[PDB]
A = this chain, B = another copy of it.
Amino acid sequence: EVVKFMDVYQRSYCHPIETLVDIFQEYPDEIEYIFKPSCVPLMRCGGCCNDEGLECVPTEESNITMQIMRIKPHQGQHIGEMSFLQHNKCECRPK
Contact = CB atoms under 8 A, between A and B. Distances in A.
Nearest to A41: B11
A22 interface: yes
A20 interface: yes
Give the copy number.
Answer: 2
A81 B3 CA distance: 9
Nearest to A49: B38
Contact of A48 (B38, B69, B81): B38
Q: Is the interface of A mostly helix, strand, loop or mixed?
A: strand
Interface in A74-95: 79, 81
Interface of A: 1-5, 8-9, 11-13, 17-18, 20, 22, 34, 36-41, 46-48, 50, 52, 64-69, 79, 81
